[PDB]
Amino acid sequence: PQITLWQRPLVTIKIGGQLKEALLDTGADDTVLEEMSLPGRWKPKMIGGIGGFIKVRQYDQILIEICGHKAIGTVLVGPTPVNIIGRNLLTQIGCTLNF
């Protein structure tokens, strides 16, 4: 699909059996979701953005579906104010910026 940017590019995603709303963020290296449980081992990580850093749990090899497109990748879980789909998964669904 072609997503305009007049409004925030919010999409529904499916992960760990849950449907969630997430922001497609080309300015995010990683995908960060609000607190939730995920399977497998995880390791701590510190990620930053506007306002500073937050500590998150890093899970690898997580399956996610965004607009019918299935992807596999690392997913960070922590006190993020919004669910964010970063470049690590945007590439997998073939998402590009165009103008």
Next chain:
Amino acid sequence: PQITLWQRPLVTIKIGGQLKEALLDTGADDTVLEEMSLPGRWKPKMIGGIGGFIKVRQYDQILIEICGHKAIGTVLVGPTPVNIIGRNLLTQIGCTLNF
């Protein structure tokens, strides 16, 4: 042009006759630039990102060129980790997300 996301979508912008590097950020409502000098009066604004909020100076109707595309809009100046081009200006240059 079409910009893939295997790497950060960093581009060259021109503001105040000077070239700077900036990140095309679809997850950002606004455009935030690192400390620099801009003309006119500014208004106060508090913006929130991944690790909290920061105070910035808001300048309106500022001329800024992005990848050769001219835009004139609101530019926020403050302690941002990197120069961010948000939706307010991405829309002016006709940018969309596609997959």
